[PDB]
Design a binder for this molecule. Structure first.
Ligand SMILES: [Fe+2]
Ligand SMILES: [Fe+2]
Ligand SMILES: [Fe+2]
Ligand SMILES: [Fe+2]
Ligand SMILES: [Hg+2]
Ligand SMILES: [Hg+2]
Ligand SMILES: [Hg+2]
Ligand SMILES: [Hg+2]
Ligand SMILES: [Hg+2]
Ligand SMILES: [Hg+2]
Ligand SMILES: [Hg+2]
Ligand SMILES: [Hg+2]
Ligand SMILES: [Hg+2]
Ligand SMILES: [Hg+2]
Ligand SMILES: [Hg+2]
Ligand SMILES: [Hg+2]
Lengths: 341, 340
């Protein structure tokens, strides 16, 4: 029920962001919500090439670092590599099949494309600070701790994709597949979408930022400055990605785009609160692990867990969820020097 | 069965290009086929912004243009806009879910992305030469000839996507869905992907270059210089895209990748040939519409057909197919200057 070019003439300004008629013509002269055109323009103006960044002196730095500090650094780099590996492909695979307005379609493709640049940057860093990159890469997939913190990310995406396939194939209704009954509900799919967007928002809004803090702590000590420069470019991209999902979510819950989604958001609002808190919880558990055999000069588990709570409150506030933590001021205002956004 | 991050630690170097274990880690320190890494690097080095190109004079040139020359130019532009609209999303929706090596995955996403830039360049051009671009964009969907010339593109993609979904949901075998039998054969799926690739190769190798010739015809007459700069940047990208599909296809037929693909490429040779022949015939028939209000000096149906046969022969020989047309020299050698 999906087509790469819907032959029906439709007003793209009147379609919902999702589940409407698949986008046929890709035009940018007009838009239902110009936030997406704006984001595309900004992301294109930020285009950068990891290769052009010199990380030459990061090798001696990483080598001179205390063992436990190497752990903190490489562990964080590995998780970041995981995040962008998924973000490079997922928005395309998961969202393109459901988008019904061209600006959002293009935004998603541009967003995903920018994530592949991020992935490319990590290979650039790893290659210049370690002799055998394979060691690093072949420890991301099985790393028990990394799967633990990354828990739930792929699942949300995968269930959305599966429901989407059933929806496009069988359509709305009650069906039979090899003796088993399979119910396909649009309302359920919409919920799956919403939960998935919330999860991606938490990924780019908090998970990425916690890793930035870990990375810039070294930059503060004039260490791993090659990596620092690259992470600064990535955080600038992430600021945009974050804005994109916040708008998607706020537009979906406000009821202007799809009344039914507005209803759905309200009722699973508590589920969303829980998934957000769980994400922050995983970040905390990770922190506890990062500094088990040694804290870092300028960043320890305590300060880091404070930051998680601090940014979590802000992000959740931005998408209409209650604040789970105690309000406080930024525990690490020095981070602002590196977050040009 | 599809996952955005497969938990199995696998040797990405031993996976086949398609249908293997979905890619988990996106690494670029190694590759089974360095050709895709090379294509990514080159495409990234070619990054350009459409709007950055000055198309100010084009409005005047276009307005001053004879009415039938406007039609030729715009009809060509509308088709190009359609191809890039499809090529911006399709490679990602149809191929991404089936790729099993990182370099190819990122290449497809980079390739698809470069297409949205092409699409954006058309909006840039349109919005700058006509008072209301909505009068151009709207007809793209309903224009019968357009739908007739591009006929068959979305079909291949859509059929591949549907079969892929059945595969990821049910896996191989003979299943029962709503009291009906649905067979899911991986071999049959490989055939679909293979013919889909051959078809994209025909689109970017022939359909695109035919449109370039029309655009550049005006360039030689010192008209629409802004459009030509843009078309000259697009063609540069497209040369990488076609190089990319030619390599996917040739690598599959070599047997060096998935053995079954090599056999399938062998069994489907006539289909191969037939779709190139048909795509060529469609380009010719489009001429009858492109020159309804009359042709122009240096660009007519006769020359269009000659070019089509000429370029098709070259493209088909590049992927090991027999040449259907009589041999001939380039009917428009002046295009070589704009193609680089
Ligand atoms: Fe990223
Ligand atoms: Fe991101
Ligand atoms: Fe293109
Ligand atoms: Fe292309
Ligand atoms: Hg999502
Ligand atoms: Hg998700
Ligand atoms: Hg750190
Ligand atoms: Hg941190
Ligand atoms: Hg780090
Ligand atoms: Hg929710
Ligand atoms: Hg295709
Ligand atoms: Hg294809
Ligand atoms: Hg195609
Ligand atoms: Hg032509
Ligand atoms: Hg063939
Ligand atoms: Hg073929």
């Amino acid at each position: 029920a999906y087509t790469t070019f819907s032959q029906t003439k439709n007003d793209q300004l009147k379609e919902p962001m999702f589940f409407g008629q698949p986008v046929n013509v890709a035009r940018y002269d007009q838009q239902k919500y110009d936030i997406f055109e704006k984001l595309i323009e900004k992301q294109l103006s930020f285009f950068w090439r990891p290769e052009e960044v010199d990380v030459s002196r990061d090798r001696i730095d990483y080598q001179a670092l205390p063992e436990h500090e190497k752990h903190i650094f490489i562990s964080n780099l590995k998780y970041q590599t995981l995040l962008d590996s998924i973000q490079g492909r997922s928005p395309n695979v998961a969202l393109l099949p459901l988008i019904s307005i061209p600006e959002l379609e293009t935004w998603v493709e541009t967003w995903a494309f920018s994530e592949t640049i991020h992935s490319r940057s990590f290979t650039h860093i790893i290659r210049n600070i370690v002799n055998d990159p394979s060691v690093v890469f072949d420890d991301i997939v099985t790393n028990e701790q990394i799967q633990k913190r990354a828990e739930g990310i792929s699942s949300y995406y995968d269930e959305l994709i599966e429901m989407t396939s059933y929806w496009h194939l069988l359509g709305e209704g009650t069906h039979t597949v090899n003796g088993k009954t399979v119910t396909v509900s649009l309302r359920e799919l919409k919920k799956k979408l919403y939960l998935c967007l919330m999860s991606v928002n938490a990924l780019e809004a908090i998970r990425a930022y916690v890793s930035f803090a870990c990375s810039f702590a070294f930059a503060e000590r004039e260490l791993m400055e090659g990596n620092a420069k690259i992470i600064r470019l990535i955080a600038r991209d992430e600021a945009l990605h974050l804005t994109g999902t916040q708008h998607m979510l706020n537009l979906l819950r406000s009821g202007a785009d799809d009344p039914e989604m507005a209803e759905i958001a309200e009722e699973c609002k508590q589920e969303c609160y829980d998934l957000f808190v769980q994400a922050a919880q995983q970040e905390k558990d990770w922190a506890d692990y990062l500094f088990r055999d040694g804290s870092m000069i300028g960043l320890n588990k305590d300060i880091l867990c404070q930051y998680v709570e601090y940014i979590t409150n802000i992000r959740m506030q931005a998408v209409g969820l209650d604040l789970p933590f105690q309000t406080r001021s930024n525990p690490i205002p020095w981070i602002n020097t590196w977050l040009v956004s």
